Amino acid sequence: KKMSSELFTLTYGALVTQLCKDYENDEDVNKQLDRMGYNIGVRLIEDFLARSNVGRCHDFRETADVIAKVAFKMYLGITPSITNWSPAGDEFSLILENNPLVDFVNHSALIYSNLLCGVLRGALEMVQMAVEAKFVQDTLKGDGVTEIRMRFIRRIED
Amino acid sequence: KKMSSELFTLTYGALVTQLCKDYENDEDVNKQLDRMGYNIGVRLIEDFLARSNVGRCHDFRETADVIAKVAFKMYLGITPSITNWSPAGDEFSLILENNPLVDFVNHSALIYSNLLCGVLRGALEMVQMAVEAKFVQDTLKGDGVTEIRMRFIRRIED
């Protein structure tokens, strides 16, 4: 089933609105969004691995290409650019020209789309890669792009 | 942007889970789902009307065809059957062979997908039709199909 993003982005809006009622502190909403993201990601990865050809890999540069060119397209209908690789090759950025989870644009500390950071961390954990994902730019805050910075921390020997 | 439904259904799952923490009474969750649905529907209708050819109409049989054959396809990637018309022509049912908002299957009173009832009522209200939508069957509860019953109440002279 392929769908337009509109019902998705409005429903995510309803969730964020509900968490703001529930917490009335934005840093708490950010954390809750990230935790729900994580629980989503750990389930999402199994759908992904069944619908892709990556097999049993744990390479970070490959992972970046797969996230950007396959997973984002499949699950959000968009393709971010991969850029800003560290010299060491252990950090990169995903750049989007707008905010994915916002189709229709006093919470300055809120990271509106923070769920996605959780999704990335949860999904990569199930393939034995401990990663940090964070928004470092957000078009919703007046930045020129939206940027998620991904840092490879370690292989998980589970 | 076209996307797979997977991230949508997992995110909706996160919302429902959050409302169950927030209310710890299922009838309250149902009502909250319906109200959020309504607020979604009132926004969704403007996207729809811009992406469709229905113009300024207020006919109930036409509305049923449009909801089932156009709107459901566009926004959820599925096409329900329209059936069980009342003799008077003021009620019909939408039949789905599973539950739309569930990709991956002590809350017996919970109407898991109740958001959709709100969406339908909110959207139709903006085109001056007062409607009731309710789940009368749910595959999640062991029924053979999922069924939303739609009743035309009145033209809204606003």
From Swiss-Prot, chains A, B:
InterPro entries: Bet3, NO_sig/Golgi_transp_ligand-bd, TRAPP_component
Keyword match Transport: yes
GO cellular component terms given for this protein: cytoplasm; cytosol; endoplasmic reticulum; Golgi membrane; TRAPP complex; TRAPPII protein complex; TRAPPIII protein complex
Family annotation (Pfam families): TRAPP
Lipidated positions per record (S-palmitoyl cysteine): C57
Tissue spec: Widely expressed. Expressed in lung, heart, liver, spleen, brain and kidney.
Keyword annotations: Endoplasmic reticulum, ER-Golgi transport, Golgi apparatus, Lipoprotein, Palmitate, Transport
Keyword Phosphoprotein: no
Subcellular location: Golgi apparatus, cis-Golgi network; Endoplasmic reticulum
Predominant cellular place of this UniProt entry's protein: Golgi
GO biological process: COPII vesicle coating; endoplasmic reticulum to Golgi vesicle-mediated transport; vesicle coating; vesicle tethering
SUPFAM superfamilies assigned to the protein according to its UniProt record, in alphabetical order: Ligand-binding domain in the NO signalling and Golgi transport (SSF111126)
Subunit and interaction comment: Homodimer. Component of the multisubunit transport protein particle (TRAPP) complex, which includes at least TRAPPC2, TRAPPC2L, TRAPPC3, TRAPPC3L, TRAPPC4, TRAPPC5, TRAPPC8, TRAPPC9, TRAPPC10, TRAPPC11 and TRAPPC12. Heterodimer with TRAPPC6A. The heterodimer TRAPPC3-TRAPPC6A interacts with TRAPPC2L. Heterodimer with TRAPPC6b. The heterodimer TRAPPC6B-TRAPPC3 interacts with TRAPPC1 likely providing a core for TRAPP complex formation.
Family that this chain belongs to: Belongs to the TRAPP small subunits family. BET3 subfamily.
Function: May play a role in vesicular transport from endoplasmic reticulum to Golgi.
Protein name: Trafficking protein particle complex subunit 3
Protein's organism: Mus musculus
